[PDB]
Input
Amino acid sequence: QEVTQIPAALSVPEGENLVLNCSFTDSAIYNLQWFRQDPGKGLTSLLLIQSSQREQTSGRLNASLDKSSGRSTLYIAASQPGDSATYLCAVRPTSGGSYIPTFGRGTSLIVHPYIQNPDPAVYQLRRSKSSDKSVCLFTDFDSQTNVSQSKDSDVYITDKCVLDMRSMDFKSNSAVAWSNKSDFACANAFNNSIIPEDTFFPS
Amino acid sequence: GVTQTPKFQVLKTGQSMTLQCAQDMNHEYMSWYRQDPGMGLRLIHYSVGAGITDQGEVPNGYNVSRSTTEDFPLRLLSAAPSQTSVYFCASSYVGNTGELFFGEGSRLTVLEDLKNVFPPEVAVFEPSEAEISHTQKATLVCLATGFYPDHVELSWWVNGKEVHSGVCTDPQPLKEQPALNDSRYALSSRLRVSATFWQDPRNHFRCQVQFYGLSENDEWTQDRAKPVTQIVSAEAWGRAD
Output
């Protein structure tokens, strides 16, 4: 009747094993299915557990099912940044139950990359061909560092993302900040979040 | 597989539209869902078989038919702003395992006035000399701003080749006017290369953003170009400096 997924959001350092829970109030189910959804994309099926099953596996993914208790657990071994996505759980009725499935609200998962050699710095990037905006890049910080929003009206700070320079087996975090080509150097934009005291701020 | 069309759509309030769903797996069961922020997936209509149709949780304002096994059309006779959502079609064999197969989704935005639709402005910002000296790496930033709705796809192309290595794009765009439901959006992306690669003047970097907007049939009475589906791009060339 009702599907509950907890935690609603999970943040963890890469390498850690993960546990995602799915609960349903009606034990009379035909099956349970787990899906993955990337931002702005569709639903990719991960595992399908039939009422007659108690466990299903696929690579680092494995899910259990306890119909009587109305529970299913998805385990993700040695998590990786690429596992970041929203995980959805759904159950379908049995014995002529309208076949109508019920979906949980999902668990938003973020697996942070391990940054071997943090080198936090804020850099100003010029031109768009000149006369456009003022853009700054906060980069190479450890994954524990959080980027908050600025207290200024004409200033924007993006969420952080990790890029991977494959050839060099090098990963780095970064967040972008910008304003409107005027009385405000963008390096000042980040002075609202907690950042390393040794962060490099070249002019 | 399951194929739904269109993938993106903008409608003016009152306009009619049909979201198509086709599957070639001989699946007897087909259904439609709408997904809204924190609202989860809500069943709108479902069909247990050809010729059979039943309403779901939020059938209000939607019409479906199932004359054939392969198709399950979702029709909006008179689009309303509240119907702005992401629509998903899913199918499965009648009994079997119960495994559901989802389509890629259809992002629909219904607006009272199309004048609120804006294409993105795109700019590329070149690597900081300080970053180059400090890390021997060079990060380019692409900024797409002022667009609405949030129906875009950003990609980087280096010397004509689409690249994924050394790139990352914001998972979600940000609102330029936070309090507004129809705020225009901004999206950023980074492309990081070695300083030596950026220093080669022969290397060409292109950031392009595909924006899904109006059809070249919608009425447009603004003193600006009709915001139709298009690609907006910006580029840069490496420099020895």
